[PDB]
Structure formats: C-alpha cells, structure tokens
C-alpha cells in the first residue's frame, strides 16, 4: 500500500535524492535514477506516481551516481570516464560540465576499464576502479591531482571518506584497506580482512555520527559491523549477495539492505527489528527522512512517502 | 546558531559517551543558549521582511535574527519540537523511577529550560502569527495548541498532553516543573 | 543481385547476410552491404506488460497447490481480469503517445487496434469458459461485455445531451433506442423524461412507455421470471395494437421484432446478435449460441462483406473450439504472449502445446540484451526440455563487468549447473590475467576449483618474485588457507611466503624446518631447489646451530640427487656453498656426538 | 553422558553433503542396526575418491586417504555411542 | 523487424567469407585482395575496423574462431596447402604454418573445447589431419596426432558438438568428387579408445551426388543426431545409435527431409544457436530458412531477393 510502483523501460541501477537544505523545513521531493544493461543508457530525474522531469543520454553505463550539490550530479561511466552534469532548474535541462575521459584505464593494454565507485566531499571527487587506481580530482581542475597507481591488483568495488583525506576501499579478495591521501607513498596504512576467508565485499557504509563504525556487505549476504579503531559483529541476514547497505541519514538507528533475491529488508535498532518492505533484483536505495526510493531490475521505481507509518 | 543546533542536538541523540551522565550535560548546555536566544527575540515588523545578499554571485537569503529562525522551526513539527517533547517524555519516565540517577539535577535544569521555552512561545506565538498574516510571507505556521495534540510518531497517539501532566505527580520533588506544567 | 550468391553467418540471435563472389572464377558494382535480420519485444510499454505478467504468472503457480475448487475458479477469473487490466493500461499509454506525435500516429493506432482485438477476444473467451455461467447469467455477462467494448451508443447520447434542446435533435431517438437495445432501461427513461414535457399527447404516450420500461421483468426463480416476462410482452403487444412512429418502433423492439432490430442495425455483428437475443430469446442456451451467431453474421453482412479473421475467431469461440481459435490467432499474431497465457489459464481450468509455445517465447526473451532474466524465469517452469535450453543460452551470454558475470553465476548456481559455472569462471579469469591483474585471476580460479589454472597463476607469481627479489601482494598470499590445496604449485608458494615471514621475525628454526620439508616433498620445481639450499646455508652458518645432524644429512642427499638429475660463477658459488655446508654440518655432528 | 566429537573437515568435498551418506549408513540392517556394514561403507568410500579425478595436481593422495580413515572412525564412534545410549535406556 | 544495414566494407576486392566469434561481437572478413580485416562492435551497433593484415598468396577459403577460453585464436586455410594460426600481442601474429598436407587444404574446423585445442584440416588428397597444441601459451607448437584416409577428395568437415561422455568424438567428412557411379560421399568417423585411432562408422550411401557442405546440429540432450547435407538438394538425416564393446556402434539412418525448393545447387548450410532453424543458400541468390513445427514438419519460413529486400 505504501509503495507506488511506476514501471519504466530501463533497468534501474542507482537511486539518489537531491540533498535538501537543513535550515529550511522542506521535504525532499526530487530524486535521480541511473540505468544499466541497455544499448542506450540514461540518467533520469524524478519528482514525487513519480513524474519524470528531465533525462540525458549517458554514454556507456551509469555505474555509480552521487549528488555533489543541489545543481551538480557526478556520474561514473563504465568506460571509466568520470563526468559532472549541471542541472538547470529554470529550463529543466541537464548539461555536460566537466569530464575526465581517461580517468580509469587498464595498465598498458588497449581498450577501457570500468569505474566501479565514486565518493564526494566538495570539491573533492575520489574515484576507484577495476584497475588499481585511486584517482583524485577537483571540481574545477582539468587535470588529475593525485593518482595512486597499482594500489590494488584486484578490482576495487567501493570507496568512502573516513574522516578527511582518508579513504576506505573494499576489493574483490575481501580486504578493507585504509588509505591516506597526504602520505606520498603508494602503500595502504592498514588492511582489515577476515581470517581465512576471501568472500568478495560488494558494499561499504559509514555511520553518520560516529566515524569509527563501518558496515560492509559480502557475497554471503552477511552484514559485518566493523570498528576501524579496534569485525565486531557478524550478522546473518540474506541468503544471497548484498549489493548495497545504507544508513538512514537523519536517524542512523535505521538501516536498509538490498539483495538480488528481491528483499529490501529494514533493520531497526531503536533487538533488531527486521521487516520486508517489498513483496527481479533490487539494485539501489536511498532514504532521507520519511521518503525512500528503490530501483529494481524489473524496470520499476518504488517510491514511499510514509516509510515509518 | 546553525552549528550549535544541528551538531549538538544530533550528538544529544546518538553518540557514544564513556560516562553516562555526559549525555545530559551536552543537551542542557546547548539548550541554555537556545533559551537565551529565544527570550530576547521581540517580534518586530521588519523581521518578517527578508533581503537577499549577493554572496559570490549566488543570491542567498540573508540571515534573519536568531529569534525568527528559532521560532519558525518551533511552530512546525521540526525535529526540534519532536526532540523537545521526547526530552520531556524521557525526563518524566526517568523521574518516575524515583531513583538516584546520574545527572538527575542536570535533567531538571534542562527540562525546566524546555518548559520555559514552551511557555514563552505561546505569547509571541499570537504576536508572530498576527504579524505573519500581514507581511505576506510564504512561511506556514500552525499554532502550538494544535501541535501539542499531534500524533506522536513513537506512541502513535496524541499523548503529548498526558506526558505533560505526569510532571504534576512529582510536585513534592520538583516544584518548579510543577508550576510550569500547571501554567 | 546480378547472380551473386548470398552467404550467411548465424550469430547469437542475428543473421548476417553478405553477398559473396559469383562462385565462378573472378555488372560492375561495389560491395557496401551487410544486413542484419531479426518489433514486439522492443516497444517499451510491451516490456512493462511482460514484466507484470511474469509476476502474475509466478503468483499463480505458487498458489496452484493451496487454492481449490470454487475458490480456485474465482482466483483464475481475477487473474484474467488483472491481465486484461494491464492490457488496457498499456493501450491507454500508447494512445497518449500517438496524440503527442501524430507523425507516427498511424503505426500506433494500428497497434492499439490489434491490442483491443486481443483484449476483447480475451474477454469473450475467458467469460464463456472460465466463468462458465449458467443459462441466464451468461446472457447478463454478454450484455455487459457489449456495453463495455462498444461504447458507441454513449457517444451518440453524449452529443445529444450536449445539444441546445436535446428533444429536437436528430440523434435523440437513436440514442434512446440504443439504450433500450443495450438493456439499460434507466438511462433511456431519463432521456424520455426530457421530451415528456414538450407536449401533452407526447406526455401521455411517454408516461405509458416509461411505465412499461420500469415494469420490465429483468434478471438480477427462472420460470417465475419467464412468466412475468411473458405477461409484460403481452401488455406491450396490447398497447401496440391499441395504438395502431418512434415510440411505435421502441415498443416494436420491446417485443423483439426482427425487422426493426434489422433496420437500425446501424452497431457491429455481435452487437446485433446481443440485441436480437435480449429481445427474442431472453433465456439463452450456450450450446446453440454458435448457430445464433452464424445467423446474425449472415444477416448483418448481407452484402459482399467477407468474414473478417476476427469474426472467424469469434465464431470458433462460439463453437467452443479452443484449438481453432489458437490456430487462427497464430497466423495473425507473431507475438505468442497472448497464446501462451491463454493456454496456461485454460490448462489450469482442466480443458485440454503449452510447453512448446512457452519455450519459444522465453527463447525470444533470451535474444534481448536486457529481457534475459524473464527468459530464465519462464524456462524453469517447462518440465522436460527446460534445463537444456537454459544451460545453452546461459553459457552463451556476453560477460563484461564483474556485476553481470556475478549475476550470471548466481543464477546458474541456484539450478545446480556446474559445467556452466566452470566455463564462465575460466573465461573471466583468462581475460583478467591477460591484462595483468594477478589477484583477480586467482579468485576466479579458486571459485571454479580448477587445479590447472591455479598452477599456472602460481607459476607466474614465482617468476615475478625471482626477478624483483620481493613478493608482490604479500597479504593475498598469506591468507589463502584451504584454497592453497587446490594446486601443488599454489601450495608451494604459500609455504615459501610463510618461511619468508618466519625467518624475518626471528623464527629461524621453524622456517628452516619448513624449507627442508618443502625440499624433501619435491613440490618445488628444480630452480627453486638451489635457492632453498642457499637459504639453508646461512641457517647452518649462524652461531646457534639450527639444522640437526640428520636434517643436514637429508639436505646432503637432496644435493646429491639434484646433482644426478642436473646431469641427466654460479657453479663456483654453489661449490663454496657445498663446502661451507659440509663444514657446519660436521661441526654440528661433532657437537651432537658430544652432547 | 555423551561425547560426540568434531565435525567433518572436507578438503575437496561438501561437509553438508556427507550427511546424506551418514543417513545411508544410518539405515537399519535389521532392527536397531543403524550401522550399515564396515565392508560396504569402506568400499564405497575408497571408490568415491577414485571417481574424483586426480589429474594435474596428483600430490594430495596421501592426505585424501587419511581423511577417509578419519571419517570411518567417526562413523564407527557415532554408531557405538548410539548403541550405548540405547542399552542405557533399556537398563 | 528485419532491418537493412549498409556498412561500407572498405574492401578493394570481392569478399569471400565472414565469421562471427563465440560471444557475437568480433568478426573476421577475408577477401580476394589477400587481406583479413577484423571488425569489432562497440556499445553502439556501429562496426569499426581494428586490424588489417595480409596473410597468404593462395586463395583463403575459411576462417574459424576458437573458443574464447583459449584466447583470441584464429585459423585460415588456403590454396597453398597452409593452415596459419593467428594471435594478438598486447596486431595479429602468425604462430605456426601447418603444411603437412600435400594438397589444397579446403576446410578447417576447431574441435569442441572439451577435447582441447585440436585443429582439423581436410585436404584434396583425401586425408584429414587432426593436430593438437600441447600448451596454450606456446601456440607455435602443433603436433600432428591423427591422419584419417578417406579414399575420396574431401570438401568439408564437421565435428559433433555433443559433449556427452557416452558419445565418442565423431567427425563427418564429405566428398565433392563428381563421381559418376561411386556413391556414399558422406562418411562418419568415430574414435575408438581401445585402438586409440579413428575408424569409419557409417557411410551415407544415399548421397550419391557431390557434397558441398555438411553440418551437425546440436544434440540438445537427445538420443539421436542430426546431419545436414548440402548437395543438389537439402537433406536432413537422423542417425540413431543402436543397442549395447570392442568396435564402432553401428547406426540406423533415416532421411527425414529433402527439399529441392532451391531448384539449384545448395552450397551452404548452417544452424542457429539452438539448432531449430536451418538456413541454405543457392544459385538463385536466395537464403531460405527452414523450421520444424510441432508435428515435426519442416517448412520454409523466409525467402530473400537479390537487391536485399525480403520476398513477400
């Protein structure tokens, strides 16, 4: 009943709301979606059935999408190119701002390498990739500020700004590496791994308040709670790979985990209360207060405005 | 103001404290400044007119006095009001236990600051609402008397009023809160 | 053209046509052509249709066991209603598209018409078989069907009531008579409530007609209805006799007069049929409906109008011949969605091919870049020939990003398709390795549990170590654990790295033991033998003796065995090594004989 | 008292799948004889690893054989303990 | 929706044979100007030429792509009795030049992956040679392992795609020799493990006319096999193995379809990915597609005109 399902024609890989001003008591209404597994993929912007406002033909596949600010959307293509789009609200038109065509490319060989994940702290854009590379750019710089080459032989899947000038990266062999952007060396400060297992890690998230709490997800569908200072807790959850984990921004006591089996579970800390919000595969989710949106591989967008009712 | 409010109220809710008592001190400390900011805000006819200053070529609304913004977030259901009511509820519950808690006096002072925040609001509520209707602003405001009866997201009822009353039971211990509740 | 033979190259779902040479040893042209042969599945709205229908199907299949009898019948009717609702929604969406772009409106309008045909046919067939209502309720539902699909009478009456003074319109009596034809008394009575006040005699006659329309026996037990109906018809006939043009015709109708039902047949053949039945035969027999319909068609298409294919389909449905309906539809429609779903529903209705059509549909789903998941879903349900098809197409899907590959593997694993898993894993690993990425290759190899590829990867690591002097990705090598036992070469690498760690952090004794163990087991290749011996050398040299006498004797044996196999600068250093080794061993042996 | 030891540590097998073989062994020869026969069980176990093709990396065979022996011992122990419990219950 | 695409071939001379890869994105176009061009497909359907090189002086007949598991391996047979193996270095590089054949190598076919990398070349002398590369990293090393004499001029070869262990490897060999009386131009060779050599199993005596092209159909988990023979008329056969050793298991043959609708010589026959739709070419310049219905009745489903338009 809560969820209103509008069927689109493109598999939805990413769903992210437009950051809302805290001072004003406004409710988030505009969110953005990115599509994959199609000949001509695209980036759409919707307003809460959701009505699409504007969309742009995105070259390649939209792997990861982050909202830099209210008017800028940073998208990572599957060809490695990291692009920034400027939203002109007055004319409802998305326009290309700045792009780094060869941000990620495999060593020596010809052809391209995919950009798995991006993270943003205006004006710093750190992008990891399948190749061992942690390229760092700036909103107005036409050049790459720093490139940690051969950082990880294995494909890196995700990235997040632990503290400042520090990034936590997960890789295909099950290793959480703490990196530092000030040290000029190309070696990780610390490497956290489960003893004996090499289960790949797909997702990583940091607690909004305390910076020492990091939650990650593996191919075994297990939620591992880590303490970067001191895995504290291993939680059995899904019976299949956990693609994305997200903490609720306003009230962190709530957590949402999406798996390919098709279950948008909700964890409530405030005895963890686990409930199935949805009745193919759920790829992404984004929550901001009482509003949540998730995109599935069944070419559908599920939007709720009364999540906690 | 923005820094204080946002950061310190967040931490009020969810942030590890080695000492249990330190959880309340932070709240009381930021709540005191909220009180003294709201006490002197006398609604003027120029507060409800706003100007736009050109900072770095981006027309951004100017910063109204601390009181304007300290009120407009109170006459709606912003998490300020929700957290204030939740704080009163927690204080009533913990005080009902009648035990020697850590930071009992601190909670007394903080909830007193909360009740005084409420009691001051109602008068300037009439005044602001009256002025507000005349300035042709777009901001919307619902009086406090309809908000106290709102649906509490925790109890799923309008039980703010019941929580308020219970402070009367503790009249022999905390008479100040008793007087404020009666008022 | 010009006698050029046309070659073909079957790809994964696409035929490539190229014009080869003239066959005979070489009209002058160029050769700039390369066509691709293969839009039901490409329409976006139709994709959404497919998605929702898949979910409906899954729901139905799971509920087949629990729901029984009358409950099950109702559930089936409801499922049919859901399918038709989705069809209607899709049709409505396409209409706004045709409105937006009138340049493609013709194509869209044609598609919309085909969809409507499918939907109305769906409804008719579904009602007759699934609902299987008795003599009376069947005619009630037929009347409903006509009203819902043929809304032409409504448009007429709409234009009427939007006139300036409706009673004087040319359409007025037409819409009244149509309301009466569709069995809706109330609206015709509200209509002639308007003219009743125009004049006095008109008033009187309208009041009489209104009374009859109100007191008309109608079904909402059978014989009683029948006698009341007979009495009402007698009364109407008497009124007609007493009167003896528009109310004339209306009461002509209220009796069921064949002429007046013919002279204003101006809606469709089936509309004519329904009107005729309602008036002439209020009680309807399902078995003779086919004859009635044939007669109605012959009467309506009295000219040279040839039975449309749709008309033929409808006649076959009236003859209760499901097979013929399916056959006719197959010729007209390439999209098998309708056919398959209809067969599925009727199969659950236990009436009777289903597996064949479903297989074809899901095979097309696997020829689409994005619709391949629905194909998997539908192939699974087919009993005997599903697995083979599934395995084939799965193994032959393009794999690019690690995401797609991971999803494919997950799908395979659930259905216990080991061979398919292995192939995919091997392909991925090979590509990864060609582009450096040693770490990624190893993981994929571990997953397919392949000893050969693991051996290969471990060999490359050792080569790199020899050249650089330092091991790369030390951490990856330390936590292999049980994956190490996959290959013998992999096992060697791990133990060597362990020795490296050990002796570095003051665990010389353990390290030496591990080294001697490795050498004696012959896991090491021959070039690593010499390095292990060189390492053993300073171990002996250290003031605190590490190797025992017997261990050094075993090393001696290995050195001598190596010398024999070798036969079947470096040499100088190795001989010096040998001599020092011997001296140390002998001193230790003395100390042991001593101790 | 009851003293059941460690589970199966399988190198190139699935610990969960060995339970089906455990139930095969748990078939009652006659009455209350959930012990199959050491002759049959041994033969079957030896033939299982032969079926597993030892191809390129054929250096793990001694380890494989030790594992067979350990499994047999554990099965025997289980059966003995069950029989003892049954006798205790009778008493 | 049958579409018509006009890709400028950029070829100075007549194109002979094109062949797609396993995953359907890379294709090789050999031409009469002694050049082999590799066209790759981008995200957009547009095709782009990536590598162009000269290969052999003799007329190149066929081009066969290997399974991607072994890498990007190509193969090209020619009039000059050579079979070259190509591989990129990261430009295509010749690794070996198989020249044991004394006559024009006419057809080259890669073995199914389960057996290994076993290239097979049939020559006009009547000898099918099955080579084998021991290590995939070193592709310059190819050792001849089996030579099968057929006593007739070989024209085409086709392996059995079946991966069932019960089905021993089988290879089919045709004969283009226009023999006036000699029949049985299609011979099937089975691999007897006991003798570790290839032995003749069945000879299709029915085919008494020159065989231009043969093609096995995927088994699809069935007891019998399907072989398409292109002669003066399209013929489809069903070889059901008999009951059951020390020798070849004899077969029972039945001709289930014979189409002379081409009214001309059928030159090429190829199945689709699932072996349901067979295509055929002819002197008429038309490609007729044949598909079986639910009653096992084969019928033509499509015909094409020379100018590229479909026949309505």
UniProtKB/Swiss-Prot annotation, chain C:
GO terms for cellular component: cytosol; nuclear membrane; nuclear pore outer ring. Keywords: Membrane, mRNA transport, Nuclear pore complex, Nucleus, Protein transport, Translocation, Transport. It is found in: Nucleus, Nuclear pore complex; Nucleus membrane. GO terms for biological process: mRNA export from nucleus; nephron development; positive regulation of DNA-templated transcription; protein import into nucleus. It comes from the Eukaryota. InterPro entries: Nucleoporin_Nup85. One of its GO terms (molecular function) is structural constituent of nuclear pore. Belongs to the nucleoporin Nup85 family. Component of the nuclear pore complex (NPC). Component of the nuclear pore complex (NPC) that seems to be required for NPC assembly and maintenance. Involved in nephrogenesis. This is Nuclear pore complex protein Nup85. It comes from Xenopus laevis.
Curated annotation (Swiss-Prot), chain E:
One of its GO terms (cellular component) is kinetochore. It comes from the Eukaryota. GO terms for molecular function: structural molecule activity. The keyword Cell division applies. Component of the Nup107-160 subcomplex of the nuclear pore complex (NPC). The Nup107-160 subcomplex includes NUP160, NUP133, NUP107, NUP98, NUP85, NUP43, NUP37, SEH1 and SEC13. Component of the GATOR2 subcomplex, composed of MIOS, SEC13, SEH1L, WDR24 and WDR59. The GATOR2 complex interacts with CASTOR1 and CASTOR2; the interaction is negatively regulated by arginine. The GATOR2 complex interacts with SESN1, SESN2 and SESN3; the interaction is negatively regulated by amino acids. Component of the Nup107-160 subcomplex of the nuclear pore complex (NPC). The Nup107-160 subcomplex is required for the assembly of a functional NPC. The Nup107-160 subcomplex is also required for normal kinetochore microtubule attachment, mitotic progression and chromosome segregation. This subunit plays a role in recruitment of the Nup107-160 subcomplex to the kinetochore. As a component of the GATOR2 complex, functions as an activator of the amino acid-sensing branch of the mTORC1 signaling pathway. The GATOR2 complex indirectly activates mTORC1 through the inhibition of the GATOR1 subcomplex. GATOR2 probably acts as an E3 ubiquitin-protein ligase toward GATOR1. In the presence of abundant amino acids, the GATOR2 complex mediates ubiquitination of the NPRL2 core component of the GATOR1 complex, leading to GATOR1 inactivation. In the absence of amino acids, GATOR2 is inhibited, activating the GATOR1 complex. Belongs to the WD repeat SEC13 family. This is Nucleoporin SEH1-B.
């Amino acid at each position: 009943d809560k969820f209103a399902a509008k069927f689109v024609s493109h598999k939805i890989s990413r769903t992210r709301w437009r950051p809302v001003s805290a001072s004003s008591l406004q409710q988030p209404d505009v969110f953005a979606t990115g599509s994959w597994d199609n000949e001509e993929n695209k980036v759409c912007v919707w307003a809460t059935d959701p009505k699409q406002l504007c969309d742009i033909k995105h070259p390649g596949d939209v792997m990861d999408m982050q909202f830099l600010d209210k008017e800028r959307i940073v998208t990572g293509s599957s060809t490695g190119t990291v692009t920034i789009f400027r939203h002109h609200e007055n004319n409802q038109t998305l326009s290309v701002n700045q792009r780094w065509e060869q941000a990620h490319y495999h060593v020596g060989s010809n052809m391209r390498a995919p950009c798995t994940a991006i993270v943003c702290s205006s004006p710093e854009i750190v992008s990891v990739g399948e190749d061992g590379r942690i390229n760092c750019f700036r909103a107005e710089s036409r050049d790459v500020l720093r490139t940690i080459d051969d950082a990880d032989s294995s494909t890196m899947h995700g990235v997040t700004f632990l503290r400042t000038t520090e990034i936590l990266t997960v890789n295909s062999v099950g290793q959480l590496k703490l990196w530092d952007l000030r040290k000029q060396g190309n070696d990780p400060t610390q490497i956290f791994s489960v003893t004996g297992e090499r289960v790949p890690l797909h997702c990583v998230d940091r607690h909004p308040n305390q910076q020492h709490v990091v939650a990650t997800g593996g191919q075994d569908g297990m939620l591992c709670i880590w303490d970067v200072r001191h895995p504290m807790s291993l939680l059995n959850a899904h019976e299949a790979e956990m693609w994305e984990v997200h903490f609720h921004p306003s009230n962190p006591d709530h957590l949402f985990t999406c798996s390919e089996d098709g279950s948008l579970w909700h964890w409530d800390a405030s005895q963890l209360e686990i409930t199935n919000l949805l009745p193919l595969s759920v790829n992404s989710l984004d929550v901001l207060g009482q509003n949540l949106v998730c995109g599935t591989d069944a070419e559908a967008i599920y939007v709720t405005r009364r999540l906690f009712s | 103001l923005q820094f204080l409010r946002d950061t310190v109220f967040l931490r009020y809710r969810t942030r590890a404290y080695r000492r249990a008592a330190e959880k309340w001190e932070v709240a009381e400390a930021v709540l005191d400044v909220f009180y003294k900011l709201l006490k002197d805000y006398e609604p003027q006819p120029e507060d409800f007119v706003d100007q736009y200053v050109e900072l770095q070529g981006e027309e951004r609304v100017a910063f109204k006095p601390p009181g304007f913004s300290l009120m407009h977030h109170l006459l709606n259901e912003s998490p300020m009001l929700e957290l204030c009511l939740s704080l009163m509820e927690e204080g009533v519950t913990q005080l009902d236990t009648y035990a020697p808690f850590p930071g009992k006096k601190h909670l007394e002072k903080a909830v007193a600051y909360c009740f005084m925040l409420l009691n001051l609001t109602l008068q300037k509520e009439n005044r602001f609402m009256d002025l507000l209707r005349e300035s042709h602003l777009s901001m919307i405001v619902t009086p406090l008397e309809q908000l106290l009866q709102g649906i509490n997201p925790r109890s799923k009822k309008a039980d703010n009023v019941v929580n308020i009353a219970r402070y009367l039971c503790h009249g022999n211990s905390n008479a100040e809160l008793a007087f404020e509740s009666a008022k | 053209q010009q006698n050029r033979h046309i070659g073909f190259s079957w790809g994964p779902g696409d035929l490539l046509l190229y014009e080869t040479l003239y066959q005979k040893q070489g009209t002058a042209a160029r050769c700039p052509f390369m066509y691709l042969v293969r839009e039901d599945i490409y329409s976006p709205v139709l994709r959404k249709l497919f998605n929702e229908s898949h979910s409906i199907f899954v729901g139905l299949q799971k509920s087949a066991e629990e729901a029984s009898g009358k409950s099950r019948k109702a559930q089936l009717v409801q499922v049919s209603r859901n399918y038709r609702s989705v069809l209607r929604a899709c049709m409505e969406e396409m209409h706004t598209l045709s409105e937006s772009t009138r340049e493609t409106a013709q194509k869209y309008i044609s598609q919309i018409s085909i969809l409507s045909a499918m939907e109305l046919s769906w409804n008719l067939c579904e009602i007759l078989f699934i609902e299987s209502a008795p003599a009376g309720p069947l005619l009630i539902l037929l009347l409903e069907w006509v009203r819902l699909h043929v809304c032409e009478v409504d448009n007429i009456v709409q234009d009427v009531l939007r006139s300036e003074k409706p009673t004087e319109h040319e359409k007025f009596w037409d819409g009244v008579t149509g309301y009466v034809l569709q069995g809706r008394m109330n609206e015709a009575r509200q209509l002639l409530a308007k003219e009743a006040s125009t004049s006095a005699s008109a008033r009187s006659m309208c009041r009489v007609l209104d009374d009859l329309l109100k007191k008309m026996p109608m079904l909402h037990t059978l014989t009683e209805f029948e006698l009341k109906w007979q009495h009402w018809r007698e009364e109407c006939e008497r009124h007609l006799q007493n009167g003896t043009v528009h109310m004339e015709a209306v009461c002509r109708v209220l009796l069921g007069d064949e002429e007046v039902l013919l002279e204003k047949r101006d809606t469709t053949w089936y509309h004519f049929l329904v009107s005729r039945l309602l008036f002439k035969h209020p009680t309807v027999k399902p078995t003779e409906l086919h004859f009635y319909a044939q007669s109605s068609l012959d009467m309506f298409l009295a000219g040279d109008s040839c039975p449309e294919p749709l008309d033929n389909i409808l006649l076959a449905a009236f003859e209760f011949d499901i097979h013929q309906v399916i056959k006719e539809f197959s010729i007209v429609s390439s999209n098998w969605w309708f056919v398959a779903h209809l067969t599925d529903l009727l199969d659950h209705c236990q009436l009777f091919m289903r597996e064949f059509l479903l297989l074809d549909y899901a095979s097309g789903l696997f020829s689409h870049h994005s619709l391949w998941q629905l194909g998997v879903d539908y192939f699974d349900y087919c009993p005997n020939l599903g697995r083979e098809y599934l395995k084939l197409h799965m193994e032959r899907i393009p794999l690019s990003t690690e995401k797609k590959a991971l999803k494919a593997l997950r799908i395979c694993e659930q259905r216990q398709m080991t061979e398919q898993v292995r192939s995919i894993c091997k392909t991925m690993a090979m590509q990864s390795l060609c582009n450096r990425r040693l770490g990624s290759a190893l993981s994929w190899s571990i997953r397919a549990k392949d000893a050969a590829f693991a051996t290969l990867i471990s060999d490359r690591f050792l080569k790199e170590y020899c050249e650089r002097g330092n091991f790369t990705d030390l951490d990856l090598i330390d936590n292999l654990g049980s994956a190490m036992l996959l290959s013998d070469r992999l096992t060697f690498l791990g133990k060597y790295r362990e020795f490296h760690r050990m002796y570095s952090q003051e665990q010389f004794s353990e390290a030496a033991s591990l080294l001697l163990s490795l050498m004696t087991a012959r896991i090491a290749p021959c070039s690593f033998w010499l390095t292990l011996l060189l390492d053993a050398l300073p171990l002996l040299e250290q003031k605190q003796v590490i190797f025992s006498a017997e261990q050094t004797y075993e090393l001696m044996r290995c050195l001598e065995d190596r010398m024999a196999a070798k036969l079947e600068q470096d040499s100088s250093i190795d001989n010096t090594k040998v001599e020092m080794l011997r001296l140390a061993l002998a001193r230790n042996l003395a100390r042991a004989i001593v101790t | 008292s009851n003293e059941i030891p460690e589970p199966l540590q399988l190198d190139f097998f699935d610990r969960s799948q060995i339970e089906q073989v455990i139930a095969n062994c748990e078939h009652k020869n006659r009455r209350g004889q959930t012990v199959c026969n050491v002759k049959l069980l041994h033969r079957v176990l030896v033939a299982e690893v032969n079926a597993l093709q030892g191809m390129a990396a054929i250096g793990q065979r001694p380890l494989l054989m030790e594992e067979i022996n350990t499994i047999l011992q554990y099965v025997v122990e289980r059966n003995k303990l069950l029989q003892c419990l049954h006798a205790k219950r009778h008493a | 929706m049958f579409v018509a695409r006009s890709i400028a071939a950029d070829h100075k001379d007549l194109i002979h044979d094109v062949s797609f890869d396993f995953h359907g994105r890379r294709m090789a176009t050999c031409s009469s100007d002694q050049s082999v061009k590799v066209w790759d497909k981008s995200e957009n359907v547009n095709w782009h030429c990536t590598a162009s090189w000269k290969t052999h002086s003799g007329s190149v007949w066929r081009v066969t792509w290997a399974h991607p598991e072994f890498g990007q391996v190509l193969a090209s047979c020619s009039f000059d009795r050579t079979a070259a193996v190509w591989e990129e270095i990261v430009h295509w590089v010749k690794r070996t030049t198989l020249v044991d054949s004394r006559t024009s190598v006419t057809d080259v076919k890669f073995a199914p992956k389960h057996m290994g990398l076993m290239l097979a070349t049939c020559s006009a002398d009547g000898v099918v040679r099955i080579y084998e590369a021991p290590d995939v990293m070193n592709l310059s090393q190819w050792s001849l392992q089996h030579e099968i004499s057929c006593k007739l001029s070989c024209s085409c070869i086709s392996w059995n795609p079946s991966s069932s262990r019960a089905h021993s490897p089988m290879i089919a060999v045709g004969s283009d020799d226009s023999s006036p009386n000699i029949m049985g131009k299609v011979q099937i060779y089975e691999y007897n493990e006991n003798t570790r050599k290839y032995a003749k199993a069945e000879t299709l005596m029915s085919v008494s006319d020159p065989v231009h092209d043969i093609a096995f159909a995927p088994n699809l988990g069935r007891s019998f096999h399907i072989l398409a023979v292109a002669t003066k008329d399209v013929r489809i056969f069903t070889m059901k193995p008999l009951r059951k050793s020390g020798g070849v298991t004899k077969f029972e043959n039945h001709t289930v379809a014979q189409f002379d609708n081409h009214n001309s010589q059928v030159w090429r026959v190829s199945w689709n990915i699932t072996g349901t739709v067979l295509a055929s070419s002819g002197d008429d310049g038309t490609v007729r597609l044949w598909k079986a219905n639910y009653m096992d009745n084969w019928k033509c489903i499509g015909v094409l005109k020379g100018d590229g338009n479909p026949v309505g």
